[PDB]
Paper text:
TRPV6 is a representative of the vanilloid subfamily of transient receptor potential (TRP) channels that serves as an entry gate for capturing dietary calcium ions in the gut1–3. The TMD is composed of six transmembrane helices S1–S6 and a re-entrant pore loop (P-loop) between S5 and S6.
Further analysis showed that this second reconstruction represents a genistein-bound inhibited state of the channel, hTRPV6GEN. In contrast to hTRPV6Open, the gate region in hTRPV6GEN is narrow and fully sealed by the side chains of L574 and M578. Close inspection of the hTRPV6GEN cryo-EM map revealed two densities of the shape of a genistein molecule at the intracellular half of the ion channel pore that were not present in the hTRPV6Open map. When binding to the open TRPV6 channel perpendicularly to the central pore axis, genistein molecules pull one diagonal pair of subunits (A/C) asymmetrically towards the channel center.
Author numbering:
A (entry chain A), B (entry chain D): 27 to 638
Amino acid sequence: ESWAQSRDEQNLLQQKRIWESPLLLAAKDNDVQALNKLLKYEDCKVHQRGAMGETALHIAALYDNLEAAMVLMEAAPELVFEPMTSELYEGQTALHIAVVNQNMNLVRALLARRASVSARATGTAFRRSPCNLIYFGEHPLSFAACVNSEEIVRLLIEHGADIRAQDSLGNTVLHILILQPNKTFACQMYNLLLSYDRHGDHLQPLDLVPNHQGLTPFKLAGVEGNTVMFQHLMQKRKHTQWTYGPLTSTLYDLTEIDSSGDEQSLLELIITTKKREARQILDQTPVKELVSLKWKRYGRPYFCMLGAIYLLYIICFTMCCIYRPLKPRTNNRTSPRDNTLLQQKLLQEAYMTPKDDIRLVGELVTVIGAIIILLVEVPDIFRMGVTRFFGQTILGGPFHVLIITYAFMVLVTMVMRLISASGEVVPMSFALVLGWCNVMYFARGFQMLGPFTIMIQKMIFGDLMRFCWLMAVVILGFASAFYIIFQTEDPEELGHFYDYPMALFSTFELFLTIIDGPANYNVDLPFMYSITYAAFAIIATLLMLNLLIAMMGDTHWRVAHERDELWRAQIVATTVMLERKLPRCLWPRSGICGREYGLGDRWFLRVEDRQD
Amino acid sequence: ESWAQSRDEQNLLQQKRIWESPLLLAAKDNDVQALNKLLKYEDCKVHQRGAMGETALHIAALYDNLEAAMVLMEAAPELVFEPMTSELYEGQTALHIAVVNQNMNLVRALLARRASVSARATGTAFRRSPCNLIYFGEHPLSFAACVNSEEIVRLLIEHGADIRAQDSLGNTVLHILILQPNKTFACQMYNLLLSYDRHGDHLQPLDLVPNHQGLTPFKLAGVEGNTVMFQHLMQKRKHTQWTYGPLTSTLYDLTEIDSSGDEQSLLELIITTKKREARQILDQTPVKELVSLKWKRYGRPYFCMLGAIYLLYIICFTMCCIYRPLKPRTNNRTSPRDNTLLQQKLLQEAYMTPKDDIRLVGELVTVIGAIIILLVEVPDIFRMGVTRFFGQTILGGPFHVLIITYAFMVLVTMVMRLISASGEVVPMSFALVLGWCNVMYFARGFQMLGPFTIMIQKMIFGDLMRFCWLMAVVILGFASAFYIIFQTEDPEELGHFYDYPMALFSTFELFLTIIDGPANYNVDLPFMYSITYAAFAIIATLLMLNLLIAMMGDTHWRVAHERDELWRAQIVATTVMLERKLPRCLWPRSGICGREYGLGDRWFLRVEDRQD
Ligand SMILES: CCCCCCCC/C=C/CCCCCCCC(=O)O[C@@H](COC(=O)CCCCCCCCCCCCCCC)COP(=O)([O-])OCC[N+](C)(C)C
Ligand SMILES: CCCCCCCC/C=C/CCCCCCCC(=O)O[C@@H](COC(=O)CCCCCCCCCCCCCCC)COP(=O)([O-])OCC[N+](C)(C)C
Ligand SMILES: CCCCCCCC/C=C/CCCCCCCC(=O)O[C@@H](COC(=O)CCCCCCCCCCCCCCC)COP(=O)([O-])OCC[N+](C)(C)C
Ligand SMILES: CCCCCCCC/C=C\CCCCCCCC(=O)O[C@@H](COC(=O)CCCCCCCCCCCCCCC)COP(=O)([O-])OCC[N+](C)(C)C
Ligand SMILES: CCCCCCCC/C=C\CCCCCCCC(=O)O[C@@H](COC(=O)CCCCCCCCCCCCCCC)COP(=O)([O-])OCC[N+](C)(C)C
Ligand SMILES: CCCCCCCC/C=C\CCCCCCCC(=O)O[C@@H](COC(=O)CCCCCCCCCCCCCCC)COP(=O)([O-])OCC[N+](C)(C)C
Ligand SMILES: CCCCCCCC/C=C\CCCCCCCC(=O)O[C@@H](COC(=O)CCCCCCCCCCCCCCC)COP(=O)([O-])OCC[N+](C)(C)C
Ligand SMILES: CC(C)CCC[C@@H](C)[C@H]1CC[C@@H]2[C@H]3CC=C4C[C@H](OC(=O)CCC(=O)O)CC[C@]4(C)[C@@H]3CC[C@@]21C
Ligand SMILES: CC(C)CCC[C@@H](C)[C@H]1CC[C@@H]2[C@H]3CC=C4C[C@H](OC(=O)CCC(=O)O)CC[C@]4(C)[C@@H]3CC[C@@]21C
Ligand SMILES: CC(C)CCC[C@@H](C)[C@H]1CC[C@@H]2[C@H]3CC=C4C[C@H](OC(=O)CCC(=O)O)CC[C@]4(C)[C@@H]3CC[C@@]21C
Ligand SMILES: CC(C)CCC[C@@H](C)[C@H]1CC[C@@H]2[C@H]3CC=C4C[C@H](OC(=O)CCC(=O)O)CC[C@]4(C)[C@@H]3CC[C@@]21C
Ligand SMILES: CC(C)CCC[C@@H](C)[C@H]1CC[C@@H]2[C@H]3CC=C4C[C@H](OC(=O)CCC(=O)O)CC[C@]4(C)[C@@H]3CC[C@@]21C
Ligand SMILES: CC(C)CCC[C@@H](C)[C@H]1CC[C@@H]2[C@H]3CC=C4C[C@H](OC(=O)CCC(=O)O)CC[C@]4(C)[C@@H]3CC[C@@]21C
Ligand SMILES: O=c1c(-c2ccc(O)cc2)coc2cc(O)cc(O)c12
Ligand SMILES: O=c1c(-c2ccc(O)cc2)coc2cc(O)cc(O)c12
Ligand SMILES: [Zn+2]
């Protein structure tokens, strides 16, 4: 916005000041004879500051003018130690520019005059940001690795580059290559930089050194969805046991992958990333066999056991609403439109028989069970929802909004029972619907979990809610029309639209065709009704048929074209929740440990397969 | 047509008159034995103007006969200066014919005898028309460039042919190459014709010469959807500022692209054309970030401000119709089928209480708001086209008609209130439905409802005008059957078909299954009722299933795959509309004026990308 306008004016007044200054211009235009005349005129203003604090060496390096960049050196050798001074390109020297532009003959002549290989481009354009378009690090050795130039990397380290150097984000030169868009070229540069880590006394192998978020180069490849570097780093963690003809028993490490409770694991960090490429890591041969192992053995059976206890809680709540205390009414019927026969009992007369004491036991099971919902989930939606992730699990999305809304409605029914307020049917009727609609979500884990089952259910609900916005204006147009047509008529003969909230609810029902069209045949209806309702019935039929076709066309686009899994991240983030809630004695750790088989303290997973 | 019938007659009349004359036949069949004999007989009629006014030299050129064409030229050299004189081929010389046929040895012999390279073939088979298979221009350079003849366009320019000659449409040779089906050969011939503009002292260059519609070759590539010539002509408008490794900062021109405020810009021409491949130019590089810049900063805020003001205007109109002046009726009910209790107040009765004065404000808001609709949208719907430019504003413009018909219905209700006419429910009922269905227009300005409203609104008028004719045939056949069956019965029990306009409305409702099938069970219905209604129920089931299968084929399959491109084409069409009507004080001009940066008085767009 205001900042994007600021970058654009900054680049235009850069080119404006390179044209209105001759030594900046000849460095750009590679006018080698124009340098000799101006520099012999008593070295005029060789300490230039252009738009981005640039000197004339920065211009000559930027446009790959090797012949013009030489003349600046013998004229004043103090320009090779000069950075750019603006906020956007802060700290960038000429050695950074020639490395990114891959100018071989220039970068030797810079090192020939002792250019610092440990400079730090701290500017706002050299920071990881979606507004920035490249993130190449902060060091010249980091710039050489990202543009894929093997010969510069061998040249820079020879002059003393530090491969252990880190950024302001803590990323070393091996963290940055995982962030690069071309994966295959970054895979060759990874093997190169590890070969120069001879260094057996640095107390840490360099591909274990964490950034300021604690992530290793292994975990960062799992978070950023870099599947090419993930499979490359996994051969460091395999161990082939035997090969019996076509069979092979491979043993995987599972130290930085499986959860230990005290530390965030790779399975959790894929979920909170919310990226589309990070879910491809869940398809990989150590991780894919781990998720299906614990969602077959502990994760799924405990999911169905918690849903069976919730079903007994809602049945116990349902019985207390059916047998709610009611007495015949005390006052007389006011209007002839008053249908009410019964009313609620007061608190003193609610409990005076032994059959009410059986109900009182059931009413206390409900309230105690409603507090437990608040005591375990008011932490959860703070932890889960706004901090890490929301709506990408099974039992997920509008489950946690609704079951919190359930337990709120039960405690409202308790208050209205105590102060003997009228209208407890209103918090109960919400709580029956809210409570039983949550049972449909536990029914989602009774499935074999295909790749396009839960996301299609989530999709169809998403299109129906978009259809309800477009049909609200169609109802409001025709309900207002139907209201003023029958506004001069007698509602004893046709009372579908007798006041305006009823006319709105009738037109909603006629749209879905769940009540019949109004007709009497013993009296003359207005003529404007018949042509309006014939227009309404054609519109409502076509809009309901186009809804079905639009759900078919949107189903095809997300199965055949969007090509996103969604089905492994749902069973991961469900299994993470049940593992933090249950104690350790009910949850054995997946894999098998060492010290009785002699491999360490590490929890290995054996995978046996057939090559064919 | 008898036009195309008359064309085929003279194509056979041409072949007859050649086959009659021995001179014309020997030119055709390349019988040079007969050529020397017919000249030594007599200097005969070598100006035999046949059916389509041609000579023997034209026939030697049409059938590619080198030896026959030469003998005509030495015997009578005055035939090279002869055009065809009919209506279908007016002005075409023999030089036009040999150039299209690419008989390049004949081109040397014709240019030796100073054949006119500036003759204009102004025939009806040379104008641009959808009934002609060719549109190659009117000039021999225009004919040579479109058949991809590099050797003849080099030959004709050397012999004094004008490159900047125009048709009777203003099209130069550069315009016509854009109108050719082979885009690849059009680009190579385009570069060759600019290389012969070395003698530029003329006020406009060739690529900056408009036709009679004012379009340049760059704009005509935009209108016709020629994306191949569009990207190649955009290289002349670019200006690369710097290159930093994989980064590139390009600076686009935006002179013939952006809305200049006076002349119809390229964004306006692509929206208001009846084509489909022009909509791919909306995804080209300078155009895509231009309209994204306008929509994020000024398009979407202004569209949602107008959307919220319109919604409050319709709620104010709705409450003035709910509280419309009604009083109890004066006279008594005539028949026992009279249901009416109330009627309209008179004008002197309608405003007596202060509750009416609150309605009097909201009725003035409604009337004033309806005049503004007829002053923003009427003085551009006649001054920018009354017929078929009007119709272009209706094809992709179905909410222009709805909001103008709304504004007339509000003003009809005003006049009937002033003259105290009875029947205001008839203009109001149209105005309530047309008022609330225009809210669906503003659904395009949202990501969540954007592509989904495309799928819901799209319906085919080929298979739905088929259904609505086949629905009306079933209704007329079965309501007439249902009428005469119950014509001898008592309508007190079953009154669904008591007179013939009601039987049409009941069978319409039974076809859509929105009222129940008539039944009593306390009385004996006729036997023909059960036979007919069972046949009617199967036919109505059949035609509903025809409508579903028709809505699943070859158009909804395309809209499901193109819903995002169609939604962005609505964003561009809205942004163009809002930029014209809003003043320049609320809409700043897009780009950056390069006046204070030494670039001329132009507005530039700076685009930065990564080339990888
Ligand atoms: C009847 C009308 C009144 C209701 C209006 C309000 C209702 C909401 C309407 C809102 C406006 C209409 C737009 C559609 C809904 C959002 C768009 C969407 O993405 O759809 C999503 C629906 O949502 C889910 O099923 C997943 C859960 C995430 C969202 C949380 C819902 C809020 C809970 C409160 C709910 C109400 C309970 C409140 C009362 C207690 C799914 O779309 P998808 O992308 O195809 O799915 C792929 C999953 N993926 C995204 C992970 C890849
Ligand atoms: C999430 C997907 C769905 C979308 C949600 C919204 C869906 C719609 C939900 C609607 C919920 C209810 C809204 C209106 C309720 C008022 C009724 C009332 O009190 O009537 C009173 C009158 O007063 C009125 O009639 C005021 C209503 C007129 C304007 C309608 C409100 C516009 C909705 C805003 C949003 C729309 C925009 C949404 C689309 C952009 C009493 O009238 P009466 O008893 O008949 O007696 C009158 C006296 N007389 C006899 C002299 C005549
Ligand atoms: C592209 C899709 C759109 C198609 C449009 C179709 C929509 C239909 C448009 C309908 C127009 C609006 C409705 C009014 C029509 C009723 C006329 C009337 O007033 O009846 C009066 C006279 O009764 C008659 O004699 C009428 C007989 C048929 C004439 C009218 C339909 C034309 C038939 C051909 C159709 C042409 C169409 C060609 C094929 C489609 C009074 O009725 P009654 O009191 O019962 O009098 C009976 C007296 N009796 C008791 C002695 C017996
Ligand atoms: C696994 C799931 C799969 C599905 C299987 C489901 C399992 C089986 C499902 C249901 C069991 C079988 C049907 C029950 C019928 C009850 C007997 C009856 O007919 O009514 C009789 C009495 O009954 C009562 O009055 C009940 C009063 C409220 C009881 C609340 C539950 C207490 C449970 C305690 C804790 C539970 C622990 C739960 C938490 C862990 C007759 O009553 P009445 O004379 O007609 O009316 C007057 C009563 N009034 C005076 C109060 C108004
Ligand atoms: C004691 C507490 C329980 C503890 C149990 C401990 C062990 C539990 C362990 C495992 C339990 C489950 C193992 C069953 C075998 C799996 C088959 C399956 O999932 O069906 C199908 C899903 O269809 C469904 O949605 C459910 C089908 C079953 C009906 C309802 C189950 C019980 C509901 C309540 C009744 C009372 C039960 C609760 C009592 C209150 C499979 O679908 P699909 O074939 O893959 O379709 C793919 C098609 N596609 C590829 C095109 C997309
Ligand atoms: C997303 C947004 C949603 C929320 C939006 C709000 C939605 C809901 C809003 C309000 C709810 C509805 C009202 C509540 C019910 C009380 C009724 C009442 O007492 O009113 C009384 C007066 O009222 C009228 O006469 C009608 C009002 C005139 C239309 C609006 C005028 C305001 C103009 C300003 C325009 C501002 C700018 C406009 C735009 C540029 C009716 O009393 P009565 O006794 O029945 O009258 C009968 C008298 N008679 C018999 C002689 C006829
Ligand atoms: C009557 C009362 C109505 C309600 C009150 C109105 C509100 C106040 C009144 C007027 C002010 C209107 C908004 C002006 C300022 C906001 C503009 C803006 O900056 O864009 C913002 C959003 O913008 C929106 O989402 C607009 C939502 C407001 C409601 C639109 C009203 C029209 C609805 C009626 C017709 C339609 C329904 C049709 C139904 C068939 C930015 O866009 P973004 O997507 O957030 O960016 C991505 C976010 N990210 C960068 C972090 C990733
Ligand atoms: C004034 C009226 C409209 C009441 C407003 C409440 C409803 C808008 C919401 C509240 C929670 C309900 C939900 C409760 C649970 C269901 C199951 C559903 O998830 C499923 O298991 C079915 C699979 C699928 O989503 O397609 C998602 C929402 C739904 C239909 C409901 C949608 C609508 C309901 C009635
Ligand atoms: C599903 C598509 C076709 C429409 C989606 C719109 C719904 C989200 C809304 C708007 C229309 C409905 C409303 C229609 C009118 C009624 C009036 C109702 O108040 C009364 O019934 C009073 C009746 C009386 O006074 O006689 C409150 C909300 C309700 C059920 C509805 C609440 C929600 C509904 C389902
Ligand atoms: C009181 C009663 C008699 C009012 C009757 C309402 C009709 C006069 C209007 C109001 C809303 C409708 C319109 C709303 C929008 C559509 C778009 C449609 O197709 C298009 O123009 C392009 C497709 C698209 O919408 O994107 C043509 C007319 C149609 C069905 C409608 C034509 C007529 C309808 C039924
Ligand atoms: C006196 C008794 C009958 C009280 C009711 C039983 C409760 C002790 C249990 C069983 C049903 C409840 C559960 C209902 C559902 C949730 C989700 C949870 O599953 C997940 O964490 C995954 C959610 C997701 O992946 O989106 C399992 C337990 C929890 C919080 C609840 C924990 C405790 C509750 C209140
Ligand atoms: C007393 C005052 C405050 C009442 C408010 C008046 C507005 C409700 C109306 C008057 C005329 C305007 C409208 C004039 C025309 C346009 C375009 C739009 O219809 C189209 O022409 C686009 C249709 C298409 O391109 O397909 C509908 C509403 C809009 C933005 C305007 C919406 C709001 C406006 C300001
Ligand atoms: C292309 C679209 C418009 C659909 C094509 C079908 C409609 C043109 C026709 C088919 C039969 C219907 C008609 C059938 C009979 C009725 C009689 C009605 O006259 C009356 O007086 C009502 C009956 C009575 O009160 O006696 C006015 C027209 C109506 C609703 C209908 C008008 C339009 C309908 C939907
Ligand atoms: O059930 C249907 C049918 C349907 C299904 C089977 C038939 O034999 C006929 C219609 C058509 O459109 C719908 C459209 C809808 O929006 C919802 C539906 O349930 C249906
Ligand atoms: O035509 C469809 C569609 C379909 C897809 C996208 C659309 O826009 C419309 C229909 C989906 O599933 C089918 C499934 C079928 O067995 C047969 C079909 O013809 C279809
Ligand atoms: Zn497809």
